[PDB]
Symmetry: C5
Subunit: 274 residues, 5 copies
Amino acid sequence: ELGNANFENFIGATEGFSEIAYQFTSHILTLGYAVMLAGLLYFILTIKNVDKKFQMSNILSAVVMVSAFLLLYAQAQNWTSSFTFNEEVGRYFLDPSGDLFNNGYRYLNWLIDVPMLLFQILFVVSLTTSKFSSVRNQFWFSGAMMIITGYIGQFYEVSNLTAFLVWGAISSAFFFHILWVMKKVINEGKEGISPAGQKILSNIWILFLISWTLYPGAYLMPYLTGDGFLYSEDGVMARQLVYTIADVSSKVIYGVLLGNLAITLSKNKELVEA
Amino acid sequence: ELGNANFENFIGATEGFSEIAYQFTSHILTLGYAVMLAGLLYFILTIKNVDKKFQMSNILSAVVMVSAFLLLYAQAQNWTSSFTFNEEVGRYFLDPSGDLFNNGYRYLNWLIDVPMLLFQILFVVSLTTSKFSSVRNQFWFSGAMMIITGYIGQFYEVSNLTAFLVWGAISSAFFFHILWVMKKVINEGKEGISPAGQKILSNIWILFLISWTLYPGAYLMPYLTGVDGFLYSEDGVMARQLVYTIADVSSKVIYGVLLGNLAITLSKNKELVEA
Amino acid sequence: QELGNANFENFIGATEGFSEIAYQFTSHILTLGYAVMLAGLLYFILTIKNVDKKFQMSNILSAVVMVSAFLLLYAQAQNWTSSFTFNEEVGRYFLDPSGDLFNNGYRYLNWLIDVPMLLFQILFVVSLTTSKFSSVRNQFWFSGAMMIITGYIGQFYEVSNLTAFLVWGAISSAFFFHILWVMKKVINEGKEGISPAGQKILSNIWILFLISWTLYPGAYLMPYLTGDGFLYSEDGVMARQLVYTIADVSSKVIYGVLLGNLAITLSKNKELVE
Amino acid sequence: QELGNANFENFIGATEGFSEIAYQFTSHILTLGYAVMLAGLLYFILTIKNVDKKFQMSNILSAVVMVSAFLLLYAQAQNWTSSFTFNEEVGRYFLDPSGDLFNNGYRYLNWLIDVPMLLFQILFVVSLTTSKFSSVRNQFWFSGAMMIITGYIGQFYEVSNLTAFLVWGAISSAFFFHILWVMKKVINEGKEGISPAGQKILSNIWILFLISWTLYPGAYLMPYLTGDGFLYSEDGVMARQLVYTIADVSSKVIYGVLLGNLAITLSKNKELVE
Amino acid sequence: ELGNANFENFIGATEGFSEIAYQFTSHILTLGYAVMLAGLLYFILTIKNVDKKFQMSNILSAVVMVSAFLLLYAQAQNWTSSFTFNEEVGRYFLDPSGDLFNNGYRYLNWLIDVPMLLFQILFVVSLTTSKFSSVRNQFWFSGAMMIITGYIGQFYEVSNLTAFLVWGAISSAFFFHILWVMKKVINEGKEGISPAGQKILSNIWILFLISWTLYPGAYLMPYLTGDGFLYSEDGVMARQLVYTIADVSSKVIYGVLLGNLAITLSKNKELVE
Ligand SMILES: *C/C=C(C)/C=C/C=C(C)/C=C/C1=C(C)CCCC1(C)C
Ligand SMILES: *C/C=C(C)/C=C/C=C(C)/C=C/C1=C(C)CCCC1(C)C
Ligand SMILES: *C/C=C(C)/C=C/C=C(C)/C=C/C1=C(C)CCCC1(C)C
Ligand SMILES: *C/C=C(C)/C=C/C=C(C)/C=C/C1=C(C)CCCC1(C)C
Ligand SMILES: *C/C=C(C)/C=C/C=C(C)/C=C/C1=C(C)CCCC1(C)C
Ligand code: NA
Ligand code: NA
Ligand code: NA
Ligand code: NA
Ligand code: NA
């Protein structure tokens, strides 16, 4: 009786994980939080070369990095504590004492981080006809709701497929909403900045779009092949890779590109340019 | 025989916690201390854009963040160490070896932090009819007493409902006193600063009022449906720990940010705070 | 229970056990201890810019103390929690041999590094009149070391051998009064030739120095201050560890703050502190 | 036990066991590893003020690498110690299943982050002549990724399947030479247009780059470089882990230092480095 | 069968450690790494007050402090992990699970740190007759070899007294060489700086000499009294105190004195006075 548990635990409690599956997941999750703390240094070290008006972008990035490090660290330790090598069969199996594995650390990370990442672009670019205050509140409300609904759903990703998908769908509503507003902001952002600045905002959009889509991909990962191929250790590896790739892109790379824009806009483009 | 223990331990020792209840509490408590360390960075990184006379506000915020991180971290680890998964029934139960769970880490955090948060506003605003030193001492005395009395009470929140509520009440006395003085401060603060600065102080009050009220809510959370119903159970534990987390974040970080923003605007450097 | 040359906490823990309140409180207060130290560090780092160059070593030495103190007081807190385990049957915490015996030695060795600095550091802020920098320092340093080293030896015996306990205690006290004597000299010579604002602070410093430093020998004797009386119990343990914590905070952080404030005023940057 | 697709360390540890010297040394050297990384970080942070704006991203990227490397090399060190337990009966360290299997994957995934940055970062110090920044970078980035990813896969098989081991190894080596080729191009074009002092450093960088990068494939093959021969033993383990450590220190820290020194000289702040 | 293990483990495996012996060793080793991280703050905080050309001294100190913290921390945890209280007899005994105790963390710390400490003086002072490049390489080569040989020897300090002392001796060769060169450096350093600067370099030498000598003292500590007085828990305490005192002196105090010299040599001597 595992109960309302993530699917990792069900694989780990039956099939077990192979060396490669466990170690890789372990490694990738470690890379996750490593990249976050590393990134922090980039934002701290470049802040002197951002003008005052843009500086909060760098600061908010830095804030995200710290939050993310700590929670993604917790997530990594959740993985390793939760599954123990069985000497007899040569596979890793669920260890009750280390607690059940749960992706909740990541999700709660999103709860802090999502509002900031959406907010923080608004310090770099300027809107035309839209109201800063409105855009922010929309971001913040939709963002919260997207994560909170998703957070509830994923508890059920095995126990109750319907609640899984209901909450998932509702989340997607809130998800799809955010995409709309962000496109609005990038477009109004593009108005009034050099072609150089424009090109960056274009890259940002593609990054934002791809990277944010990854998340619901990883939500569904176990099932994207119906007891098929990804309902296995392969699925676990796949989920945790994608989450890691997503989080790195959506925070660090995202933050870097914003920072680069803010730096160029400050006529300190020499720092970012080679 | 648990004794003078928090009610979490009694739930954990009888009902057990469901996966969702345990994991959520675990997650939210982690979010708690994560946000504190994160916040620290905000205060450090904005300090250059506060004028010298306001800068102690920023510094005191930073101080709080560090204290809070460390003690809230301790609090999170208290939770996780104290309750272990039972594979047979699929619920988390009290682990004696990991020590009893207690909210005391949080409370003693308050003991350091409350004085600073009350103190620190006084470096941004200027009073009219009150003396800096008087307001501070009131804050500091009442603040200490509020926490110390509350701290004693919560040990009894199961063992002895009377002492629970006595100490609770006494605490509440000092609580209202602080509210009273703070309202005085924010009003005198509002006198003589631009409308922009005024509006922030207004938000600060609302935040201060709502967020500080949460705490006694969370104190009583187990019993807010008396002797039964949703709140004397794992649901109550989740509820308490969410509210504490929300409270602590609001009362320290958000509070500190709003003060910081005020101090930054007052320094004629509003450009990084608003854009 | 063949405990040997052990602190009295272990003897209580090994017989009576600690109640929930006693254990948790001690645990909490010891945590507060090291938390306050690291917090304080931030104050000293962040204020250094506002003290003039010639006083700045006071701030630096404070910062140094804070770090040392954090690490050792952290170790001390972990010593407490490791050393006593909840007994499910009776609902009290009892000595756990595996987690090592509890010992206040971490704290004492902290004193060994910290005491010389705290005595030294005032000399950067004040100017002596009649007394010789070199003499005052060496006296502080010699007496300071000896006070701690003798105390450190004594406390091992606070149960095993009451005589050595009190002998070493007394010897320590000799050096204690010496330090008090010299420090009073310093504060008074310090007061000669500095602004009234500076004077007032040095007055406060002395009161704080005096009260806070007296606490220590109080806590040394705490188990016995009521002869098998009231404080030879879990109550005594709580009492000792509260007092040590209060002492250490006052004698380092508050002390350091007051010195900092003095150094800041003497630099004509008093707008920060008011 | 039944180990599967595991590193060879585990097979030694599961049969021969490790001697005190072998275990302790490996333990010590791996600790040195991550210690040096965090230490290095301090150098890059502290010297950045003395590099001109246009070079500064070199120092920043170094700093980023240091942090990533600390965290992952720390993980790697703890992987070693957790995985092998002293057996009091024989006086040798043996594989502990509970501490999880040892795997070098932490290191490899560290490479995945770090390799692109180290190759990238030189381009902020020097200017190319005949080559296109964009092309050189993409080659570095693509080949770098592929080199590590292929290597990462191979090393899982270094015992289980020697053919896959060597295939993947070889494929990796393809991309390796490519990177070497491009880097030589870069260092030469880099040398064009800077003082002889700067030139001399770029020369040293190349020899360091060349030697240090070569070490890695040496360490890949280390168990077999003597066929059930001399290095298929605890000696081989020691040898591998020393070489990896030496490589990583050289290829990141020393490499980074030399680049930093170049950037400092180019900024006419050569007095710092002299 | 402990094998090629440090002597601490043999005491811990037979005699056991008394409360005082264990706790003291535990405490002192903790003080060790605590002082390192503390020191770091001093070097970071004073850096602004040393001129550009001396600044690498402060930086190299800072680097050492961090390395030292981490490895001395590891060393402290090695001690506590390795010996467990026995409730029946009231003594601490060797715990296999916590791994055998070994001073190797410290030694490998030396491997990183020795080159820097020898190097770093050269950023503050200027040589007269001797060649920067040569002095450094001598320091670096001899320094490495001194540690590597010592590191090998100490594994044998119980198992094989001959290898212990051979490797020890070889190490000592390189040791004196470093002492020789350093004296050369301090003297050439003294040429062309004020008497104030001179006096500091004099203190540095005394400190350098005393503190560095301590190390081989601690190497031999178990035997310095032949089944004698120091082949006991007393010897363990003695070794670990001396190592701690040595490391603090040879890095932190050393670094401070150099920093003070660098600060003095710059306009702003007021900070250190
Ligand atoms: C730094 C973290 C970020 C940017 C997280 C973003 C998370 C999402 C976009 C999540 C989206 C989800 C859905 C659209 C459906 C399933 C539930 C979620 C929350 C994973
Ligand atoms: C950062 C922490 C803060 C601002 C803590 C505030 C705590 C309170 C306002 C506590 C109030 C209480 C009562 C009014 C009654 C019950 C006992 C307390 C202490 C929880
Ligand atoms: C930061 C730590 C400080 C300022 C420690 C001060 C410690 C003392 C003044 C200790 C005094 C003692 C006696 C006077 C008798 C008993 C032994 C001592 C060392 C506790
Ligand atoms: C900081 C880490 C660096 C610079 C890592 C470099 C790694 C390599 C050059 C690895 C090369 C390999 C081969 C050429 C064959 C075997 C597989 C590899 C990846 C170890
Ligand atoms: C910061 C660490 C330092 C300065 C270490 C210095 C170490 C030595 C001078 C060691 C000397 C030794 C001998 C001369 C003989 C025995 C082996 C050694 C390495 C301990
Ligand atoms: Na595991
Ligand atoms: Na748990
Ligand atoms: Na305990
Ligand atoms: Na081990
Ligand atoms: Na132990």
